[PDB]
Amino acid sequence: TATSGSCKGRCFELQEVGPPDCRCDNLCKSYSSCCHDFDELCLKTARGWECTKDRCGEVRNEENACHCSEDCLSRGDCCTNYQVVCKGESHWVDDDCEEIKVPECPAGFVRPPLIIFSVDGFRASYMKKGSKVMPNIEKLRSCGTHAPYMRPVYPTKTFPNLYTLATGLYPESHGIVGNSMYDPVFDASFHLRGREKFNHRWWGGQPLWITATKQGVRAGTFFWSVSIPHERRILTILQWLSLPDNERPSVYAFYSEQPDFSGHKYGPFGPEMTNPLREIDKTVGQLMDGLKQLRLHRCVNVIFVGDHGMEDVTCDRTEFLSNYLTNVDDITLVPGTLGRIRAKSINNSKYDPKTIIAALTCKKPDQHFKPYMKQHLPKRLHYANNRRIEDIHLLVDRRWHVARKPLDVYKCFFQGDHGFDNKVNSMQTVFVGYGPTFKYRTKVPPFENIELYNVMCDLLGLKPAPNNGTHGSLNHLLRTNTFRPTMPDEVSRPNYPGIMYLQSEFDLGCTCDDKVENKLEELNKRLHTKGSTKERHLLYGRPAVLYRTSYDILYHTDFESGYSEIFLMPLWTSYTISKQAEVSSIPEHLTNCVRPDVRVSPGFSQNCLAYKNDKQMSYGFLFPPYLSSSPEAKYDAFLVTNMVPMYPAFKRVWAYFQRVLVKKYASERNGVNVISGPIFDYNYDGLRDTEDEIKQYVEGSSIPVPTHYYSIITSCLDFTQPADKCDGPLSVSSFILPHRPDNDESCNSSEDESKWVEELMKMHTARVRDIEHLTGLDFYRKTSRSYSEILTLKTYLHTYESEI
Ligand SMILES: *[C@@H]1O[C@H](CO)[C@@H](O[C@@H]2O[C@H](CO)[C@@H](O[C@@H]3O[C@H](CO[C@H]4O[C@H](CO[C@H]5O[C@H](CO)[C@@H](O)[C@H](O)[C@@H]5O)[C@@H](O)[C@H](O[C@H]5O[C@H](CO)[C@@H](O)[C@H](O)[C@@H]5O[C@H]5O[C@H](CO)[C@@H](O)[C@H](O)[C@@H]5O)[C@@H]4O)[C@@H](O)[C@H](O[C@H]4O[C@H](CO)[C@@H](O)[C@H](O)[C@@H]4O[C@H]4O[C@H](CO)[C@@H](O)[C@H](O)[C@@H]4O)[C@@H]3O)[C@H](O)[C@H]2NC(C)=O)[C@H](O)[C@H]1NC(C)=O
Ligand SMILES: O=C(OCc1ccc(OCC(F)(F)F)cc1F)N1CCC2(CC1)CN(C(=O)[C@@H]1CCc3[nH]nnc3C1)C2
Ligand SMILES: O=C(OCc1ccc(OCC(F)(F)F)cc1F)N1CCC2(CC1)CN(C(=O)[C@H]1CCc3[nH]nnc3C1)C2
Ligand SMILES: [Ca+2]
Ligand SMILES: [Ca+2]
Ligand SMILES: [Cl-]
Ligand code: NA
Ligand code: NA
């Protein structure tokens, strides 16, 4: 190699140098390529970090870590408390907050800088619970914009979350799917320790610093060597902000390994945790006093953001694959707060994932982890579409670990850990935004960390790279946006078929006992088929179809559907169930009733014979017969165009939802509007499948089998108003249930539906936005709400955790 040359006047230089030369940037330590004099010139420590009364007006001495001399301000290198100790100034924390209506920047600043202050393991409840010891953070929080918590991404580990913050992408798309990974195409392994993580090939997407660079905005570094202490990181950022206009970056990052580092040792609320929270707050204080000195404290936007929280976890709460598997040695486990399993050797053709899962399913009474094939994980986790994510996964219960065998845990160190399902309260983390671009004293609802990349791009005037945020859904955070989104254009307009077919044209092998026979009640049934009740059942406009297809709008007394001539079933079925609505049962004579739809050709219909011949597959209905508004209207629910294929095991789930839960939600929420439909995602990419991607059909037919069924359940946020007459904001909960031929996922399934079904639905809670990706549909096109507010609503997730 080559080291010689000097960091003289180059400490923490922003552009990298090429060999021959030794490096003086904050990455050099990691390449053992710093110049011989790096520590000496760049990592000065003499006299510590604060001005004292006597150092005031001192003679500049270049060996000091920071300066209290008369020239320090313009040299850009005073200690952060200089003006307080020597010029009678006040600490930023002691000043009242004053609204920052416009940026107040020094001449030459083209745009307010962004500083991202990122804290590791900063659990959401530390904001309330540590508030006495964190006065600077608490001023940021209460004078700026803050959420009660921010939802990390799964796994709730450091690398997936930091890189998701930086890219707006799910780990499956960015590639950093855990703190440890194996990539079979590379044949390589990635870890926290080691040089492997420095290779380019792991890091997908386009993180904020690159977005910035490519578009002409300069960035400080987003990597700090572990041995550079926090005080020096702050001084380096402050120095960079004193650079000349042509050289000065616009976006900066600070990172603290605390409080995570302590949390692992002592638990989230260990008595030892007070100090690290004091010490982070003191750092924030140094940055803010430093900004105030440079007259930048009403100019810079500051983001205080965590990557994940921290949970109580101990060695005795470890489940061992050795208590379940006899073939334990033929597998590799990525262990801990999640499990990922693959074959130890791919020259082993006796390795069977099928039997591995079976041996891990529902085996002990209080079993603290649950196996899944990755494509069967809740769709809200978005954790399947990457060759680095193993087919077998274990979702581990909060407070537990999974290990391969006892030797692995002993050959108790720790009291805290994180990595669990990102809905878990103890995994939630923080967000505060403070500055001219953020709002003043404003609380916003919790949101997902995938949304921030768009906002940081807005804050810096950048166009974001394509990402998983929904741009506009966080506009309510900002005093001025620059992003006004517009509704996507409908691609396919519907047909509106009338009565075009006689009953005898159909040979579907279907039967119904419906031959049971007046211009009042026959002009009425005509009007219902023309959409006379459509304002009742279709409350927010019809969904828009965002891809090219052929489909028909079908109207009925009790429901409206968008029926796909390609997939031979509805894409969406819309209906409203008022608080007053009544549950009836299906009359005996109509148990097996399926009726041809005279609006839709035999050639674009399902048939009953296929369901008869298919021994695995049965069928269900999207608008539930149980909720029909009259005995005559019920006939509408048995139309072949309301049928969808369903495994008998799944009919147990679906029947309970339709018979029991919809009515329950209607009475609790004062009416609900329900939109239900099928989802096809056979390649588990989270995106609607094209017809040529379907792997399963009802036997001997072209009726495709859904991988999932969704419902979107909307009511009035002010529940004193009924769902069909709501004048203000809406409230939504949704789900994406896996369409599975067994109920192995639910260990209590041999019991009554009242003991397990709702728990399954809760697990498979979803955002309307997840359902849009999966169906190519766009919901809520006609409301009186602003589009920004609708976007927020579409990104909402009902989590079913208790309060924070
Ligand atoms: C969350 O958001 C993201 C981002 O919007 C969504 O992900 C996007 O989804 C798109 C649809 O699936 C997908 O489009 C693909 O793109 C293929 C080419 O992609 C490569 O280039 C991308 C662009 O690079 C630019 O920007 C980067 C910096 O970001 C620079 O490096 C470049 O210089 C460019 O300027 C690049 O982003 C992408 O990265 C992935 O792959 C890398 C390794 O190669 C990874 O390191 C990285 O992390 C990305 O990995 C993810 O994505 C891949 C799939 O791309 C996935 O397998 C991984 O698991 C991981 O999840 C690539 O380098 C393009 O080839 C595709 O074209 C096929 O389909 C089209 C449809 O229009 C057909 O017209 C065409 O026929 C073609 O088919 C051909 O190929 C077929 C399959 O190989 C074959 O069967 C067929 O017969 C044909 O030969 C398609 O357009 C985006 O790439 C993807 N972007 C990202 C960043 O992931 C995601 O969907 C969102 N999630 C949800 C739930 O909504
Ligand atoms: O700028 C970066 O390096 C610094 C850095 C990296 C990470 C971090 O922090 C990580 C964390 F946030 F987690 F802390 C903090 C940091 F300074 N990166 C982005 C540019 C590349 C190197 C890595 C990725 N490259 C590639 O060629 C990719 C290959 C495969 C791929 N797929 N899609 N596109 C691609 C392109 C060059
Ligand atoms: O300087 C850095 O990060 C800047 C940055 C990078 C990217 C951003 O993206 C987020 C943004 F875009 F929003 F800014 C935001 C940012 F601060 N790094 C310091 C070095 C490590 C990566 C982060 C390697 N490492 C670890 O292995 C820790 C894991 C867990 C832990 N617990 N105790 N000890 C530890 C050690 C920490
Ligand atoms: Ca972390
Ligand atoms: Ca798909
Ligand atoms: Cl991991
Ligand atoms: Na059958
Ligand atoms: Na079961």
Short mmCIF file of N, CA and C and ligand atoms in Angstrom, two decimals, residues 119-122 156-159 161-162 179 255-257 260 264 306-310 418, ligand 4:
data_model
loop_
_atom_site.label_atom_id
_atom_site.label_comp_id
_atom_site.label_asym_id
_atom_site.label_seq_id
_atom_site.Cartn_x
_atom_site.Cartn_y
_atom_site.Cartn_z
N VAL A 119 -30.36 8.76 16.11
CA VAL A 119 -30.03 8.08 17.37
C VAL A 119 -30.44 6.59 17.32
N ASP A 120 -29.50 5.70 17.68
CA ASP A 120 -29.70 4.26 17.61
C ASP A 120 -30.46 3.73 18.83
N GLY A 121 -31.53 2.97 18.59
CA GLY A 121 -32.32 2.37 19.68
C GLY A 121 -33.14 3.35 20.49
N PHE A 122 -33.42 4.54 19.95
CA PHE A 122 -34.17 5.53 20.67
C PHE A 122 -35.67 5.22 20.60
N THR A 156 -36.61 -4.84 12.62
CA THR A 156 -36.30 -3.62 13.34
C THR A 156 -34.85 -3.61 13.93
N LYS A 157 -33.91 -3.80 13.01
CA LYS A 157 -32.46 -3.73 13.20
C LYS A 157 -31.88 -2.45 12.56
N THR A 158 -30.61 -2.17 12.86
CA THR A 158 -29.92 -0.91 12.50
C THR A 158 -29.68 -0.67 11.02
N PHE A 159 -29.08 -1.64 10.32
CA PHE A 159 -28.73 -1.40 8.92
C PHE A 159 -29.99 -1.33 8.05
N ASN A 161 -33.00 -0.36 8.92
CA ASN A 161 -33.61 0.94 9.20
C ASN A 161 -32.87 2.21 8.80
N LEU A 162 -31.56 2.26 9.03
CA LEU A 162 -30.81 3.46 8.57
C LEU A 162 -30.88 3.56 7.07
N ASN A 179 -29.02 -7.33 9.66
CA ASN A 179 -27.63 -6.98 10.07
C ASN A 179 -26.63 -8.04 9.61
N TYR A 255 -24.64 10.75 13.80
CA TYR A 255 -25.10 9.44 14.30
C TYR A 255 -24.59 9.20 15.72
N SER A 256 -25.47 8.74 16.60
CA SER A 256 -25.11 8.22 17.92
C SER A 256 -25.46 6.71 18.08
N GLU A 257 -24.48 5.92 18.51
CA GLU A 257 -24.67 4.49 18.79
C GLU A 257 -25.46 4.30 20.08
N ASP A 260 -28.78 2.76 22.07
CA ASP A 260 -28.85 1.35 21.76
C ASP A 260 -27.79 0.51 22.50
N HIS A 264 -28.84 -2.62 25.11
CA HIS A 264 -28.54 -4.02 25.02
C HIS A 264 -28.08 -4.53 26.39
N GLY A 306 -34.90 8.30 15.16
CA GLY A 306 -34.38 7.03 15.63
C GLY A 306 -34.49 5.94 14.58
N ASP A 307 -33.72 4.85 14.72
CA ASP A 307 -33.89 3.77 13.79
C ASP A 307 -34.89 2.65 14.24
N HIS A 308 -35.00 2.39 15.54
CA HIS A 308 -35.92 1.33 16.07
C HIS A 308 -35.89 1.56 17.59
N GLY A 309 -36.79 0.94 18.33
CA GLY A 309 -36.73 1.02 19.78
C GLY A 309 -35.88 -0.13 20.37
N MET A 310 -36.33 -0.66 21.51
CA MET A 310 -35.57 -1.65 22.32
C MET A 310 -36.58 -2.33 23.27
N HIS A 418 -33.72 -5.92 19.91
CA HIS A 418 -34.72 -5.33 19.02
C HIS A 418 -34.61 -6.12 17.74
CA CA B 4 -30.00 0.51 15.62
#
